[PDB]
Amino acid sequence: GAPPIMGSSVYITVELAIAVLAILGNVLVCWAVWLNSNLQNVTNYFVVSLAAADIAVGVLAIPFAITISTGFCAACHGCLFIACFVLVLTQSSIFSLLAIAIDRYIAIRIPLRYNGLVTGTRAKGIIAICWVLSFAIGLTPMLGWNNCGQPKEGKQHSQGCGEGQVACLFEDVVPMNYMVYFNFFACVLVPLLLMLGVYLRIFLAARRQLADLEDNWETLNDNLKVIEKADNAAQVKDALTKMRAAALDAQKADFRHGFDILVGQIDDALKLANEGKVKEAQAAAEQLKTTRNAYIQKYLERARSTLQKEVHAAKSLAIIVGLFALCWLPLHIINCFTFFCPDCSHAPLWLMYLAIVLSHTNSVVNPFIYAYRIREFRQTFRKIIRSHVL
Ligand SMILES: CC(C)CCC[C@@H](C)[C@H]1CC[C@H]2[C@@H]3CC=C4C[C@@H](O)CC[C@]4(C)[C@H]3CC[C@]12C
Ligand SMILES: CC(C)CCC[C@@H](C)[C@H]1CC[C@H]2[C@@H]3CC=C4C[C@@H](O)CC[C@]4(C)[C@H]3CC[C@]12C
Ligand SMILES: CC(C)CCC[C@@H](C)[C@H]1CC[C@H]2[C@@H]3CC=C4C[C@@H](O)CC[C@]4(C)[C@H]3CC[C@]12C
Ligand SMILES: Nc1nc(NCCc2ccc(O)cc2)nc2nc(-c3ccco3)nn12
Ligand SMILES: CCCCCCCC/C=C\CCCCCCCC(=O)O
Ligand code: NA
Hints:
The chain is mostly helical. The protein folds into two domains: 4-173 and 348-388, Up-down Bundle (Rhopdopsin 7-helix transmembrane proteins), CATH 1.20.1070; 190-329, Up-down Bundle (Four Helix Bundle (Hemerythrin (Met), subunit A)). It is built from 14 helices and two strands. Helix 9 packs antiparallel against helix 10 (255-274) and helix 10 (255-274) packs across helix 12 (288-340). The structure holds cholesterol (3 copies), the ligand Nc1nc(NCCc2ccc(O)cc2)nc2nc(-c3ccco3)nn12, oleic acid (OLA) and sodium ion (NA). Receptor for adenosine. The activity of this receptor is mediated by G proteins which activate adenylyl cyclase. Residues 4-9, 69-79, 146-175, 341-348 are extracellular.
């Protein structure tokens, strides 16, 4: 077999390349939020917490990963910290992603109550709690759920470690039942499915409110034609009363002026209809068309635009969650095979390190998603680049 130093030279070189890109891209994200006040909102404070975790992958997790690949001799609990620190960062990322999804769900479901419920001070408290919990979850093996008590004696002496020390290799010290049941199923898979559900509910909420808007508009147009071809006064009254309710639920969901005019003109044409005079009620109802073409349509178009922007923004953030799953699932699935099929040959070492490298590349991608999908980030990236390096 080829000397190990050659394959490991490739692995280390790729890891360092990834580390550099992870640091630089995510520093740019934090720099962007710091300088641009329009990026300083609660949503982007979770983005920054996420960027901080990805910087930490480059500065600490990748160096740790290089170290533990050598199988060096170490006190088992020190090795455990080297092996598990990345799990703290991945857990922090999951909490940040989950918080962003819930944030966007609150924004679209109760926007009038959003800024009252979701504040920067409460968000900062949530970020601190999530980091603390990330340390507890990621370092649980250090509390005793580990195989430090059953060291591999052959590797210990073949590597020449003193006693009290282990050959520091991930799968020798971190139990597979922890990685599969606790880390993967409970701490990764369940939150991922939760976020899938929240984003589904976001798109459904946006679709329902768009439909409601269109319904109210066609209800105001349909009943206009009804009034224009009516003949009994009860006819005109029935239609006008269905326009008033439609006009009010649209009011809830200088346009306060446009609707005052609309409601007033409906009330006018309504009191005429109650008095029997229909032709003058129809005449009064036909001026609604200019209030509609002058105010209501304009507001219904920008309400449509706002929802479309929220949906497009929700899609961009959902892409972040999908790429997280794509980059981390292979390693988890491999662990499932190692754990659940003792009759299977272990995944080959080159595939293990490909899966590790892939998980680390996730710390590089998010800055690119922001620049391509989010105008405010893209433009802030441009200004920073063209001004502070050229
Ligand atoms: C930059 C600062 C904030 C963080 C860096 C701290 C890192 C380098 C420190 C903190 C704890 C340290 C570990 C503590 C215990 C051991 C066991 C020993 O047998 C080998 C070294 C080893 C594995 C240390 C490696 C270095 C280590 C991981
Ligand atoms: C998108 C998410 C929900 C997909 C997660 C599905 C994972 C848990 C599934 C997909 C393929 C499955 C593996 C397929 C084959 C085997 C071999 C069998 O001898 C042990 C179970 C084992 C190892 C399965 C474990 C569970 C597994 C890894
Ligand atoms: C891109 C993501 C979503 C899907 C990738 C699925 C990958 C991780 C799956 C597809 C085929 C799987 C391999 C199929 C066969 C074996 C041989 C067995 O003795 C060890 C596990 C091992 C080596 C599996 C490891 C996991 C594996 C490589
Ligand atoms: N199984 C596993 N192994 C490693 N590194 C050890 C790779 C290895 C595996 C077997 C072997 O004989 C020599 C080396 N890192 C790992 N990281 C993870 C992981 C992180 C998050 C989810 O899974 N799993 N995982
Ligand atoms: C400024 C950020 C500092 C970055 C710190 C990262 C440095 C790499 C950390 C771990 C390498 C040290 C572990 C090597 C122990 C080998 C001891 C031995 O010979 O057994
Ligand atoms: Na991350």
